[PDB]
């Protein structure tokens, strides 16, 4: 079968596959990431994500936990800055009460003050653990040192805001950012019919569009963090294309040309122009890749390096020089064809799993209200052509950069030197 995406007049779009698979999954996609926050509610989103277990105006936290557990179902709340999605997974027989629990959570939080209060200690941890991988700190700092207002807001709650987030604020967010028109309910394992018959009840309530989407403004800059780690992490990005343009496809082809993760375990990722350009000069251990994060109004594209503090300089320079070569037209058509094959294989393996398929449909829904068959994409990625890739490169090599560095930064260069 195929998804059938239908936009209920309330604005919510319903879509299902009913693969008749054993464990059906259903997820609500609501544009409610930190992006949609503002300066005085920093943190609301984080808590909201960890507070999927607070008594709902219809169910006790106890039942919520026990109920979902009993049926073996699972409710998870992923969240990016551009958006956020709640997801329930389970047996086709128990997904009626799973939709009861999920739709109660999404549309009716009691946000009891005592309850929310109990969570702020759990909040410290998340923001904390997620930072184990230095990468997190970097990407966060990066999106921050790079943007001014909207996409600069962190995914994790700041240290001063813990103890200050109140139930009111949370409720405020939902009623404001979590409205119907900004949501979409995609379900794999259910009948499109019922989705309409269980959303027409709870979701169509918040009919308004919702708080305006704060636009995002680029700022440039660099934030560094001397913390004495063994490895220097450094991300250097610039402004790039947004969601909904062919230049975003050009930038995706550009990161798969430059290198977007190893395909072989213990490989050296030989092809990566970056990896090759670093490895021809530096014998130290390193990890150089291309970073691309595009949101519906703005995108960041650049390079990400992990290296020994000492070599941190020229390695970064070598990586930067490689991108400048791509900005000068120094590329081959076989390399671009291999980059396109890598990108399309990555897309197909991303959508080959059930939860990735449900997320993709979800994202497409909120983003364009339409479903784009995997096939369609393949021919559009093919549309990207060599010159297009080169173009995106020059955008990066010219646009003001934003640099987030961490480690022993005694030999890490600056932007005016880079």
């Amino acid at each position: 079968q195929d998804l059938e995406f239908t936009k209920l007049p309330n604005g919510l779009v319903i879509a299902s596959l009913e693969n008749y698979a054993p464990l059906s999954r259903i997820g609500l996609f609501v544009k409610a990431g930190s992006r949609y926050e503002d300066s005085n509610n920093l943190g609301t989103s984080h808590l909201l994500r960890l507070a999927s277990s607070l008594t709902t105006k219809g169910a006790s936290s106890f039942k919520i936990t026990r109920g979902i557990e009993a049926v073996g179902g699972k409710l998870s709340v992923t969240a990016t800055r551009e958006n956020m999605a709640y997801t329930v997974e389970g047996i086709r027989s128990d997904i009626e009460i799973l939709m009861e629990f999920l739709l109660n959570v999404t549309t009716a939080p009691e946000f009891r003050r005592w309850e929310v209060a109990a969570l702020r200690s759990q909040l410290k941890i998340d923001k904390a653990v997620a930072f184990q991988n230095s990468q997190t700190r970097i990407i966060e700092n990066l999106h921050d040192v790079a943007y001014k207002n909207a996409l600069a807001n962190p995914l994790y709650c700041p240290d001063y805001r813990m103890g200050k987030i109140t139930s009111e604020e949370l409720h405020y967010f939902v009623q404001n950012h979590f409205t119907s028109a900004r949501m979409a309910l995609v379900g794999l394992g259910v009948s499109h019919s019922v989705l309409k018959q269980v959303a027409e009840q709870f979701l169509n309530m918040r009919g308004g569009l919702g708080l305006a989407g704060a636009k995002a403004k680029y700022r440039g800059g660099e934030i560094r963090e001397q913390n004495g780690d063994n490895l220097v992490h450094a991300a250097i990005v610039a402004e790039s294309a947004a969601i909904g343009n062919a230049e975003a496809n050009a930038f995706s082809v550009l990161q798969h040309l430059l290198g977007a993760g190893p395909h072989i375990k213990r490989g050296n990722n030989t092809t990566s122009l970056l990896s090759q350009s670093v490895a021809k000069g530096s014998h130290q251990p390193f990890d150089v890749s291309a970073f691309n994060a595009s949101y519906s109004d703005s995108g960041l594209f650049g390079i990400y390096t992990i290296s020994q503090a000492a070599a941190a300089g020229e390695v970064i320079n070598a990586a930067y020089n490689q991108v400048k070569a791509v900005a000068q037209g120094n590329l081959s058509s076989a390399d671009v064809q291999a980059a396109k094959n890598k990108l399309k294989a990555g897309y197909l393996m991303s959508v080959e799993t059930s939860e990735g398929f449900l997320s993709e449909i979800g994202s497409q829904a909120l983003a364009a209200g339409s479903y784009m068959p995997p096939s369609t994409v393949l021919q559009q990625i093919d549309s990207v052509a060599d010159a297009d890739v080169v173009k995106a490169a020059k955008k990066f090599v010219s646009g003001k950069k934003s640099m987030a560095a961490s480690g022993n930064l005694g030999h890490t260069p600056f932007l005016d030197e880079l």
């Binding site: 984080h46 994500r49 960890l50 999927s52 277990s53 919520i64 936990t65 979902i68 557990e69 699972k74 409710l75 998870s76 709340v77 992923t78 969240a79 990016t80 800055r81 997801t87 941890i125 998340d126 904390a128 653990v129 997620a130 930072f131 184990q132 991988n133 990468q135 997190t136 970097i138 990407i139 966060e140 999106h143 995914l155 994790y156 992490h233 990161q255 977007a260 993760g261 990890d287 150089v288 890749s289 291309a290 970073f291 691309n292 994060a293 990400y304 390096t305 992990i306």
Partner: peptide, 28 residues
């Protein structure tokens, strides 16, 4: 101590993940 502690460099945006299930983490 980041409660219960655990190198691959991030190349994609991050996505927090928490919920009823015990596991909870972030991916690039």
């Amino acid at each position: 101590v980041l409660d219960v502690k655990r190198g691959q460099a991030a190349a994609r945006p991050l996505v927090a993940t928490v919920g009823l299930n015990v596991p909870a983490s972030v991916r690039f």
